[PDB]
Design an enzyme around this catalytic site. Structure first.
Site, PDB file in Angstrom:
ATOM      1  N   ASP A  50      22.246   8.312  20.312  1.00  0.00           N
ATOM      2  CA  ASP A  50      21.948   7.734  19.010  1.00  0.00           C
ATOM      3  C   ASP A  50      23.088   6.796  18.636  1.00  0.00           C
ATOM      4  O   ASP A  50      24.051   6.632  19.390  1.00  0.00           O
ATOM      5  CB  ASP A  50      21.753   8.817  17.942  1.00  0.00           C
ATOM      6  CG  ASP A  50      21.015   8.305  16.725  1.00  0.00           C
ATOM      7  OD1 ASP A  50      20.417   7.215  16.815  1.00  0.00           O
ATOM      8  OD2 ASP A  50      21.039   8.983  15.678  1.00  0.00           O
ATOM      9  N   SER A  61      17.715  -9.326   3.192  1.00  0.00           N
ATOM     10  CA  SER A  61      17.524  -8.951   4.587  1.00  0.00           C
ATOM     11  C   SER A  61      16.962 -10.098   5.417  1.00  0.00           C
ATOM     12  O   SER A  61      17.137 -10.108   6.641  1.00  0.00           O
ATOM     13  CB  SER A  61      16.600  -7.736   4.685  1.00  0.00           C
ATOM     14  OG  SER A  61      17.041  -6.692   3.834  1.00  0.00           O
ATOM     15  N   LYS A 105      10.738   7.280  19.510  1.00  0.00           N
ATOM     16  CA  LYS A 105      11.761   7.789  20.420  1.00  0.00           C
ATOM     17  C   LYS A 105      11.319   9.100  21.058  1.00  0.00           C
ATOM     18  O   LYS A 105      11.606   9.350  22.235  1.00  0.00           O
ATOM     19  CB  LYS A 105      13.096   7.954  19.694  1.00  0.00           C
ATOM     20  CG  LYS A 105      13.002   8.545  18.308  1.00  0.00           C
ATOM     21  CD  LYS A 105      14.374   8.695  17.675  1.00  0.00           C
ATOM     22  CE  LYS A 105      15.168   7.405  17.757  1.00  0.00           C
ATOM     23  NZ  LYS A 105      16.520   7.555  17.156  1.00  0.00           N
TER      24      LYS A 105
END
Ligand SMILES: *[C@@H]1O[C@H](CO)[C@@H](O[C@@H]2O[C@H](CO)[C@@H](O[C@H]3O[C@H](CO)[C@@H](O)[C@H](O)[C@@H]3O)[C@H](O)[C@H]2NC(C)=O)[C@H](O)[C@H]1NC(C)=O
Ligand SMILES: *[C@@H]1O[C@H](CO)[C@@H](O[C@@]2(O)O[C@H](CO)[C@@H](O)[C@H](O)[C@H]2NC(C)=O)[C@H](O)[C@H]1NC(C)=O
Ligand SMILES: *[C@@H]1O[C@H](CO)[C@@H](O[C@@H]2O[C@H](CO)[C@@H](O)[C@H](O)[C@H]2NC(C)=O)[C@H](O)[C@H]1NC(C)=O
Ligand SMILES: *[C@@H]1O[C@H](CO)[C@@H](O[C@@H]2O[C@H](CO)[C@@H](O)[C@H](O)[C@H]2NC(C)=O)[C@H](O)[C@H]1NC(C)=O
Ligand code: CLR
Ligand code: CLR
Ligand code: CLR
Ligand code: CLR
Ligand code: CLR
Ligand code: NAG
Ligand code: BEF
Lengths: 371, 1174
Positions: B411, B588, B847
């Site tokens: 991670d 963003s 994941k």
């Protein structure tokens, strides 16, 4: 708005951390060939000792299972397939024995009755100890129901009732628990019932000079400690009966003074030990005092046991013994072969190390540092 | 994960008669807020555990023997002494799993009892303008203290500062104007920057409990669908002025998730919608699997093979016992007095060898696994003293996997990186200031060939000297009230020298202006500390801005205060107030934050923008510039990009009053407009910044965990390939993978995207774009365009890192890259030949799907090291869940196997502990299956004599004291206290771990070889005593009577026990004082217990075995040759295969005893930033 308010480290040991004191060995030709050579030398020496000891034991085995038929009433020799003499002093002393049969018409047991007389010669002595056992080939005494067939309460002399004899655990006498009249047999089970019945003599009647016969004794053939389990009977003399095959030894039953005391009956204790394998060699006569000199001797055997009805065999086995029991060269052979194998393996390893050896410890002989 | 099954949450309104069926209880029920991570539910623990235990086929065989020896009476003795062992074994496993679940329940109770404030004073009606100013409020309505477990749907929840949100809440009020809360989503996603969340518009009128107690409304919400960037709700109320129902949309921005930490905000008041399992995490969590090991399945197959051997033996026994009963004349019809006969013979021979697989197999393996887990827990080098957390295992059955782990899916939030951002270097006027010895450069220098330890310590000493010189110079130049050396991340000494005036006037003036601009263009707030009033801390929306403002305040350019229109700046001591005329916030989609200030001088305007490197380089002026500072700055930024430094850029420009007047005119045109005024502000923002003058750049290192660049090196040297299933975004992941030595400088970065820059060539539906990208990447570099011809051949390679590339996948490109079967195989075959596969913007489900794809297809052992509530799914579905512990991650440590302190412990939990446990079990299983064959085979070999009638060769007490006392403890010790090489040599040479990768220690051919050795051994162990008895059967040294089958049984048992114990000792890698002591103690146990049992009362048939057997020279003469002939073949094969064909471990041990690894200490650990040069 008044809601305005407000030692585990592992014990570092030598065992907890798995860092105990140890030695990490490696099998290097500096610490392999010496081990192989040492083991080889030790085993060859021990095997040579054992073989030298075994090449001196003398034995006499004589099978008489067909004395009631093939023998005569005169002194006739025994066929070569019934006797074997092993004497290290004279390795070529055949001198076959001589047997004869003297029928006794009193007994109504036509299967096996009479008496066999066997004259055998020994050209050497037997120091301070002579054993006479009975060999029973082709007799199967190691079966599932035969072996578990007795009661350890009647063996311990207890007055076991019918339930404790029949409704016991996995070790009990199921087939022969009770007779027809309603009296539980005292020796129960197929082991005591099927006891060896040939009556061996109490001495080896000499032939050469009859003034001194060689004596034997039926006392001291079983372990003394075994008398700590075979206790005397505690039955009421009226609730027992001999086993169905013991009806010729006690034809009238079990009266006051005929109940056998199994404690001092060492042959019965010898028979309540069911042999493991097929052959059954059990000691029956022992001599602890006198040496058995050379010459001819004679055995008077009372044939009461039927053996030829299942093509079985039986006979006498007389021997002095050794520290490794009777004559059996298997131990010496195995020791010699182990030693020779270890020596040959050490030599092969030496050859492979001096002709096709490798480096001691290289950084290019690993799996990743090579490709 | 279904979006259907909507719900409706009322507040101060009773539900209509449509939802309540006259019992006052609505038909709908909501799950309790309690989190449940326990493996077995406390109501169904026993049935599930018993089914899991009886999964093994030996347990079913034992149950079959039980039920067929109990019903079939008069075949065996009382069965009361045969069910007790199995029941005891089952109850032991039950207590062990219950203890594990009790530990997990203790953790869940510690988690569930966290404090929260719930609105108490008005009853709940769910489970058992806006403000009506006319009605009086309720004086008892307050926010009372409560726990998480009692947070039901419809309860008004107030979250304080730095307080974790209980469940999903609809934002209603916040202390700040406009209700702009800031949440730290470091658990639900990789975003290290604080996410902004706006509250509802109509709900801004209320500010305390007295206003919300008069509020009445209802929220119609969709069903929980386990998505982090999507939500649809409808807030509805009734106006207090007129009679009408008003509705308002509720998007994701009005939602407070569970794992979100309310940060940099006083208090947020909201209403709970989803609870417990309905939260956005507990749906992406999973079902906490049982986590069976890998050797257990091959163990079941081995048990089946032993069943096959048992059936063969019983068949050939029942045939001969049944052929012999049809032969005449035998000695049975005189003295002893075919379908069912053969059947009873077969089922007697079954109970004869009923221990070819003993009851002590699944109780020895469990003891070994628990002991290895305890020895993992009590390792001192797996203890992180910063928070008192040893490596606590939570799944005890998973202990041999760590020796077979091949893939590691890391991670990037609390696993590879810490949560600190340190300003390291900067570029002012084309001059690069800054010093740092990055561990990436250390690995680079090691790969070059130079020394790293001594040179590294020397360089660190020089950095320390430069640091103290810089501190002294900055303290002697001026005095600042906010200065503090412990927060001085910058270390260069030339910066202060050129800031005081040692490089001219223009350079000093430009450095001063740059340091001032760093403290101007930011939305950072200042808050006075709780304890120290003078130490005003900086609360910012992002950590990089905090680092920038900190390194600005360090150099004598402190920024304090937030006035109405302006901010105070202490330059070297003098305080001056500026005037922030406008602040274009960092969006963003903009990737740049701008500030327009009014600098006097009519005055002038100053536009200072801070953004990315390329983003600001685009909005530059290649004509009116130095034309020498641009090339130098580009070279410096390209240099910093190869050191994990996420660089920024700063550009200023001067403006006259007419330009700013024109800009504010078009702004008032755009700001107060309608019909998508967003695009208008975007274009005016683009046209004001169409030209700028770059005045400097920055560099902020995201610090990794300690010793990560070296732990990664060790793992990659062992063969453990690692992927990085990252979170937040792409560029952060790239620079981090550059920081730790995963991404090199020559590795090409294959980018697999959907709507990127290389997608116009394949412009189509995203599926075809991803397919074409993967196919073109699988064609030119490594041509393997195919699915079943290359994957089928690559599966039988066990994994060897090669290719010299890297792969970066996005979130959508991943979601498309594993939706189809052919696409799955192509993507996996691509990543299998890559060196540094990464990921970006990956949701928990994605994941987890990646982990399942690598696990199921191309069967290997995966590892799921990671911290965060989003990492729970991949942790659970990876067969090894290593959750990073701490005061931050309190949900990915529970639903995991191990909870280590920091990542640097993995390279020890897997490289030395895992390899040890794997080799120990791979040596124990064949030894255990071999020590029972050598015994029951003797019971069979006594069958070719006696004609298989079913007579036990050993006493009834050796069948239960051979698998229990004579030979169990040496095997347990070989499996608990064995070590290939010491941990120093284990971590010095990690390549040995490759043996655990190829599955080269536990294969079925080894078990077959061990069973054949057991067959031969048993042959010798039985036929040496027989051959002693074979001639005349009088071998006792005094006649006197041997040959009871129990005495031959003692012969055989002695030879077998000695051979088995010396065999366990031969295959042990190290000989210590414990294993040898217990081997001698087991031999003495056999001898002394024979001595105690024979010389005793209840030993009816035996009664003298010890005195009658052990006292004869023939017994020892047979025992010695028995042991030698049972050990000579295996020992010779070992001595040849360790001389002629030595494997890796043999060479390692030879060079270890030679004196190669005799300099390093006992507790060596190359993954340590404090180890000395040894
Ligand atoms: C030594 O033990 C022997 C056990 O084998 C035993 O042989 C058995 O003798 C009994 C007679 O007492 C036989 O019993 C049968 O005999 C009558 C007449 O022949 C039959 O009609 C009956 O059916 C009765 O069952 C056994 O058959 C016989 N056993 C064998 C195997 O032949 C000897 O008698 C014992 N020795 C002495 C001295 O008695
Ligand atoms: C009990 O029964 C015995 C028979 O087993 C008997 O022993 C003898 O005396 O019985 C026969 C009668 O003379 C004789 O031929 C046996 O040789 C004897 N057996 C032994 C062992 O001496 C006893 O006399 C009987 N006793 C009583 C009191 O009746
Ligand atoms: C030693 O044994 C021999 C052989 O039996 C004895 O000689 C004969 O013994 C039988 C009975 O055992 C008598 O019927 C004969 O009369 C004996 N013959 C002679 C010539 O005496 C011998 O008497 C025994 N010696 C001793 C001392 O008991
Ligand atoms: C060997 O000598 C011993 C000791 O004298 C003998 O044992 C005794 O023998 C006599 C026989 O005259 C018995 O009366 C005694 O009861 C025996 N003593 C015991 C049993 O304690 C033994 O018989 C001799 N054996 C041989 C074969 O000569
Ligand atoms: C390794 C294999 C091939 C060869 C092993 C050598 C063994 C089997 C051979 C070599 C010498 C042989 C021995 C030579 C002498 C004798 C003495 C004789 O009275 C009994 C046989 C005996 C004892 C032989 C037994 C077998 C023997 C020991
Ligand atoms: C469920 C299964 C495994 C139970 C066992 C079934 C088999 C192994 C058993 C049950 C019936 C048995 C057979 C019964 C009859 C005979 C005939 C006899 O002349 C030879 C043995 C033989 C051939 C037995 C062999 C073993 C046998 C076939
Ligand atoms: C001598 C005559 C009368 C009986 C023959 C019995 C022997 C020779 C036969 C019958 C059953 C056979 C066995 C059947 C099964 C096995 C188990 C296997 O793992 C090794 C071979 C072995 C052990 C065979 C060896 C030979 C064997 C034991
Ligand atoms: C009454 C007398 C004759 C009995 C003699 C029995 C002898 C031969 C037996 C009984 C006890 C045995 C010993 C018991 C213990 C050991 C220790 C072992 O590490 C080597 C074998 C050795 C040394 C045995 C050698 C043989 C031995 C001495
Ligand atoms: C990688 C492995 C499988 C390669 C095989 C190595 C082993 C199994 C082979 C290679 C050399 C072989 C040995 C060569 C020489 C001998 C000596 C002979 O008197 C007994 C057989 C024995 C002992 C062979 C046993 C098997 C052996 C040791
Ligand atoms: C006794 O057996 C031998 C051995 O074959 C035989 O030659 C002889 O004829 C047999 N005697 C009688 C009487 O059958
Ligand atoms: F919070 Be992460 F990078 F799964």
């Amino acid at each position: 708005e008044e809601d305005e308010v407000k030692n585990r480290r592992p014990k570092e040991d030598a065992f907890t951390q798995q860092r105990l004191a140890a030695i990490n060995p490696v099998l290097t030709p500096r610490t392999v060939l010496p081990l192989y050579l040492l083991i080889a030398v030790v085993f060859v020496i021990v095997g040579g000792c054992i073989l030298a000891q075994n090449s001196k034991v003398d034995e006499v085995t004589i099978y008489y299972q067909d004395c009631m038929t093939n023998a005569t009433s005169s002194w006739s020799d025994i066929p070569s397939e019934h006797w074997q003499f092993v004497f290290h002093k004279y390795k070529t002393y055949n001198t076959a024995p001589q047997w004869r049969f003297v029928d006794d018409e009193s007994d109504d047991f036509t299967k096996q009755r009479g008496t066999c007389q066997i004259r055998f010669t020994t050209p050497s002595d037997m120091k301070n100890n002579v054993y006479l056992n009975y060999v029973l080939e082709k007799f199967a005494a190691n079966h599932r129901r035969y072996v578990l067939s007795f009661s350890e309460d009647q063996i311990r002399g207890e007055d076991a009732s019918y339930e404790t004899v029949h409704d016991a655990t996995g070790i009990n006498c199921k087939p022969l628990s009770k007779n027809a009249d309603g009296k539980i047999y005292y020796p129960c089970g197929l082991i005591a019932n099927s006891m060896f019945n040939d009556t061996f003599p109490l001495q080896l009647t000499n032939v050469g000079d009859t003034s001194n016969n060689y004596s034997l004794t039926n006392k001291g053939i079983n372990w003394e400690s075994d008398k700590k389990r075979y206790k005397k009977t505690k039955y009421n003399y009226t609730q027992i009966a001999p086993p169905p095959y013991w009806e010729k030894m006690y034809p009238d039953g079990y009266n006051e003074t005929n109940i056998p005391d199994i404690q001092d009956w060492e042959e019965f204790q010898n028979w309540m030990r069911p042999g493991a394998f097929d052959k059954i060699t059990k000691l029956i006569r022992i001599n602890k005092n006198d040496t058995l000199p050379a010459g001819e001797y004679q055995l008077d055997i009372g044939l009461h046991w039927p053996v030829l009805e299942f093509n079985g065999k039986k006979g006498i086995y007389l021997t002095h013994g050794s520290h490794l029991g009777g004559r059996n060269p298997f131990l010496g052979i195995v020791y010699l072969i182990g030693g020779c194998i270890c020596a040959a393996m050490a030599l092969i390893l030496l050859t492979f190390w001096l002709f096709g050896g490798r480096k001691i410890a290289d950084a290019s002989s690993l799996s990743w540092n090579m490709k | 994960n279904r979006s259907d099954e909507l719900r409706t949450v009322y507040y101060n309104l009773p539900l209509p008669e449509d939802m309540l069926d006259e019992d006052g209880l609505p038909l709908a029920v909501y799950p309790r807020n309690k989190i449940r991570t326990t493996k077995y539910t406390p109501l169904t623990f026993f049935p599930k555990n018993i089914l899991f235990q009886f999964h093994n086929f030996a347990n079913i065989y034992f149950l079959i023997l039980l039920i067929l020896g109990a019903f079939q009476i008069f075949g065996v003795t009382n069965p009361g002494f045969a069910s007790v062992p199995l029941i005891v074994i089952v109850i032991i496993t039950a207590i062990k799993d219950g203890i594990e679940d009790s530990r997990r329940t203790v953790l869940d109770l510690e988690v569930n009892n966290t404090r929260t404030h719930i609105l108490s004073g008005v009853k709940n009606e769910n489970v058992a303008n806006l403000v009506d100013r006319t009605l009086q409020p309720n004086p008892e309505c307050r926010f009372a203290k409560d726990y998480w477990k009692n947070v039901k749907v419809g309860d008004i929840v107030r979250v304080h500062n730095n307080d974790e949100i209980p469940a999903d809440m609809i934002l209603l009020s916040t202390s700040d104007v406009d209700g702009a809360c800031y949440v730290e989503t470091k658990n639900l996603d990789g975003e290290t920057n604080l996410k902004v969340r706006q509250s509802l518009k109509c709900s801004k009128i209320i500010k305390s409990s007295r206003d919300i107690t008069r509020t009445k409304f209802w929220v119609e919400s969709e069903g929980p669908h386990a998505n982090l960037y999507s939500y649809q709700g409808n807030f509805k109320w009734q106006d207090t002025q007129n009679g009408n129902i008003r509705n308002e949309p509720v998007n994701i921005n009005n939602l407070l998730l569970r794992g979100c930490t309310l940060r940099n905000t006083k208090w947020a008041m909201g209403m709970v919608i989803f609870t417990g399992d309905d939260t956005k995490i507990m749906i992406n969590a999973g079902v906490t699997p049982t986590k069976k090991s890998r050797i257990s399945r091959e163990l079941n197959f081995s048990v089946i093979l032993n069943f096959v051997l048992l059936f063969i033996l019983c068949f050939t026994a029942g045939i001969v016992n049944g052929v012999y009963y049809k032969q005449k004349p035998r000695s049975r019809d005189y003295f002893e007095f075919a379908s069912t006969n053969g059947f009873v013979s077969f089922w007697v021979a079954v109970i004869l060898y009923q221990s070819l697989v003993p009851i002590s197999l699944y109780i020895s393996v469990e003891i070994i696994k628990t002991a290895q887990a305890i020895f993992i827990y009590t390792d001192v080098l797996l203890y992180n003293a910063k928070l008192d957390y040893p490596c606590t295992p939570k799944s005890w059955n998973i202990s041999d996997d760590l020796g077979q782990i091949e893939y590691i899916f890391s991670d990037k939030t609390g696993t590879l990186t810490q949560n600190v951002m340190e300003f390291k270097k900067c570029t002012i006027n084309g001059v690069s200031y800054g010093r740092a010895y990055t561990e990436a450069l250390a690995g680079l220098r090691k790969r070059q060939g130079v020394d790293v330890e001594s040179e590294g310590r020397r360089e660190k000493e020089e950095i320390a000297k430069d640091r103290e010189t810089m501190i002294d110079e900055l303290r002697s130049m001026s005095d600042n009230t906010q200065f503090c050396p412990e927060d001085l991340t910058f270390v260069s000494k030339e910066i202060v020298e050129d800031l005081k005036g040692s490089s001219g006037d223009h350079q000093q003036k430009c450095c001063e202006h740059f340091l001032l601009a760093l403290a101007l263009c930011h939305s950072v707030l200042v808050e006075p500390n709780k304890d120290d009033p003078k130490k005003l801390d900086i609360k910012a929306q992002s950590p990089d801005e905090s680092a920038l403002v900190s390194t600005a305040r360090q150099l004598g350019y402190s920024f304090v205060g937030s006035s109405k229109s302006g901010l105070i700046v202490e330059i070297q001591g003098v305080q001056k107030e500026f005037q922030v005329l406008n602040v274009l916030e960092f969006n963003s989609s903009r990737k740049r934050m701008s500030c327009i200030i009014k600098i006097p001088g009519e005055p002038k305007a100053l536009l200072i923008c801070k953004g990315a490197d390329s983003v600001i380089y685009s909005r530059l002026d290649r004509t009116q510039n130095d034309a020498t500072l641009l090339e130098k700055t580009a070279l410096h930024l390209e240099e910093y990009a190869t050191e994990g430094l996420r660089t920024l850029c700063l550009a200023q420009r001067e403006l006259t009053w007419s330009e700013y007047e024109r800009w504010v005119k078009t702004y008032d045109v755009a700001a107060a407009s309608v019909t998508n005024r967003e695009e208008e502000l975007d274009k005016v923002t683009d046209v004001i910044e169409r030209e700028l003058i770059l005045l400097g750049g920055t560099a902020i290192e995201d610090r990794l965990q300690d010793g990560v660049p070296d732990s990664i090196a060790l793992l990659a040297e062992a063969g453990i390939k690692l992927w990085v299933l990252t979170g937040d975004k792409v560029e952060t992941a790239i620079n981090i993978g550059f920081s730790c030595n995963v991404l090199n400088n020559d590795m090409e970065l294959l980018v697999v995207k959907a709507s990127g820059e290389d997608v116009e060539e394949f412009g189509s539906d995203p599926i075809q774009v991803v397919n074409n990208l993967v196919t073109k990447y699988l064609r030119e570099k490594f041509g393997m365009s195919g699915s079943e011809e290359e994957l089928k051949e690559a599966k039988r390679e066990h994994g060897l890192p090669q290719g010299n590339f890297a792969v970066i996948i996005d979130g959508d490109a991943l979601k498309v890259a594993l939706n189809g079967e052919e696409m799955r195989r192509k993507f996996l075959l691509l990543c299998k030949n890559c060196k540094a596969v990464l990921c970006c913007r990956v949701s928990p489900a994605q994941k987890a799907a990646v982990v399942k794809l690598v696990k199921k297809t191309l069967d290997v052992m995966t590892l799921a090291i990671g911290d965060g509530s989003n990492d729970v799914a991949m942790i659970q579905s990876a067969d090894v869940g290593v959750g990073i512990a701490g005061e931050e991650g309190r949900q990915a440590v529970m639903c995991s196997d191990y909870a280590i302190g920091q990542f640097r412990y993995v390279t020890r939990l897997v490289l030395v502990h895992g390899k040890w446990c794997y080799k120990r079990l791979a040596e124990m299983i064949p030894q255990f299956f071999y020590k029972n064959v050598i015994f029951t085979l003797s019971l069979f070999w006594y069958g070719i004599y006696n004609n298989f009638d079913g007579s036990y060769l050993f006493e009834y007490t050796y069948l239960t004291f051979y698998n229990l006392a004579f030979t169990s403890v040496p095997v347990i010790l070989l499996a608990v206290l064995d070590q290939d090489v010491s941990d120093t040599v284990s971590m010095l040479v990690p390549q040995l771990y490759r043996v655990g990768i190829l599955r080269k220690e536990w294969n079925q051919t080894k078990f077959l070889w061990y069973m054949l050795d057991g067959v031969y051994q048993s042959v010798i162990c039985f036929f040496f005593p027989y051959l002693a008895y074979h001639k005349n059967m009088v071998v006792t040294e005094n006649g006197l009577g041997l040959d009871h089958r129990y005495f031959v049984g003692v012969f055989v048992t002695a030879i077998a026990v000695t051979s088995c114990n010396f065999y366990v000792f031969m295959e042990q890698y190290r000989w210590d004082w414990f294993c040898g002591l217990f081997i001698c103690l087991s031999l003495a146990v056999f001898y002394g217990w024979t001595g105690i049992w024979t010389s005793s009362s209840s030993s009816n048939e035996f009664y003298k075995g010890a005195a009658r057997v052990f006292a004869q020279p023939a017994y020892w003469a047979v025992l010695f040759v028995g042991v030698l002939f049972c050990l000579l073949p295996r020992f010779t094969i070992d001595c040849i295969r360790k001389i002629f064909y030595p494997k890796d471990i043999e060479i390692v041990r030879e060079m270890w005893l030679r004196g190669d690894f005799d300099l390093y200490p006992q507790g060596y650990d190359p993954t340590d930033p404090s180890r000395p040069r040894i």
